[PDB]
Amino acid sequence: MSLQFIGLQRRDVVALVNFLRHLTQKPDVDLEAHPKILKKCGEKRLHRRTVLFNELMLWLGYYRELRFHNPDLSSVLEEFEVRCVAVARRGYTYPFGDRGKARDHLAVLDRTEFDTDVRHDAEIVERALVSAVILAKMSVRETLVTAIGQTEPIAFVHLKDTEVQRIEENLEGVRRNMFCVKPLDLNLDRHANTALVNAVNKLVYTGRLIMNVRRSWEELERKCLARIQERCKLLVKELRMCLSFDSNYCRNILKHAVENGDSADTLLELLIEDFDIYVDSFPQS
């Protein structure tokens, strides 16, 4: 995919293109995580309109790289389905302090089917996690907060803390890098406890991983969307003073919205299509 800047050298577009082509094998995937690459785009080195166009081109290439690299979910979703089925089987034949509310929470947990669009998997996996954690806290015979309004926190139940800090370091590392998925199953779970506790710990670890990769994807895509709308509004404002055919034409490109993903994609392909037309309105070098 051709990504053209204007006031840029050969070495800098080489560095930017093998940064954008080698992002998934680099830790801490964020633009501001590697800000020398962003200052290679060249703020204060160049004029305003050209560096604003270069920033918007970089953010478009970043959004295309994000949406194309497409964080995979189907295998971890399938093992999450069989783990929900396993916790449902283990909760049938178990004696509880109360049968009715246990049966109610188990009824919320089972028959759990995910939609095809990735937006509503998070709330369904969250209600599955809160049902599983209610079964966990009640099955170990300790109290839960029964205050109406406040939900019970999604946490591991009766764990040794070295596995807990292992979970914190793994989940923070995937808060940095979210494209290489690595489901690290808890083989360090101790036996001789209740098997329902072991099944719900593995289930809640996979649920924490799923909700957190969706959270990281949402926050990064929302940050990039806000930044690209900011760059588009600044370029419309900055280009407004000059008047020509090419100037008003480049204005008529960026009047399209950017709040949708595919709107940003058609913005990028349009802005790369007739790039030689409006390039006279932008000063070079």
Binding site: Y249, R251, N252, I253, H256, N260, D262, T266, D274
Partner: protein
């Protein structure tokens, strides 16, 4: 068409941009060229009131819908050298120079002693910048709410909306 319209990749547009395929793919049932989702809830409510109860009451149900064949009307109405050649720093001559149908269209409805017929027609041609599309009949398959979905769960209501058309009072005898 009778095929369901699933993605956001069918509907797209470019606007004020030299776009040959969207002028080529007119009178086609596939693309459904829409600008951007501007209609929010209150404007949707006002729009529904104006085209559902405010219009047919006051006309006493005498309106109609029409779609102008916009490409041929625009090529016979603005492809003149007084429009293509334009400067940006004798009334019989300019009424001849504008056209033969346009000169009977903007002769009094927008022309006064301050600006002649040729002057305001440049600003009128300046809105061909944002060209529309042809008329399309869209049918709206929509089930009911979550209340009376239980009665007949298979029935889906069918509405019929006009796109790039116009609510019209009387037949345009010049058009």
């Amino acid at each position: 068409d009778r095929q369901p319209l699933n993605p956001a990749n069918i509907e797209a547009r470019h606007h004020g941009v030299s776009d040959v395929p969207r002028l080529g793919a007119m009178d086609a049932d596939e693309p459904l060229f829409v600008d951007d989702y501007r209609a929010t809830d209150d404007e949707w409510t006002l729009q529904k009131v104006f085209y559902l109860c405010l219009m047919p009451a006051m006309t006493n149900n005498r309106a109609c819908g029409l779609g102008l064949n916009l490409k041929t009307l625009l090529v016979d109405l603005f492809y003149r050298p007084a429009f293509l050649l334009m400067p940006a720093a004798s009334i019989a001559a300019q009424r001849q120079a504008v056209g033969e149908m346009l000169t009977e269209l903007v002769e009094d409805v927008a022309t006064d002693a301050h600006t002649p017929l040729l002057q305001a027609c440049r600003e009128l041609f300046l809105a061909v910048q944002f060209v529309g599309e042809h008329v399309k009949v869209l049918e709206v398959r929509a089930p009911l709410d979550h209340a009376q979905r239980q009665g007949l769960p298979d029935f889906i209501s069918r509405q019929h909306v006009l796109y790039n058309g116009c609510c019209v009072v009387t037949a345009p005898k010049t058009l």
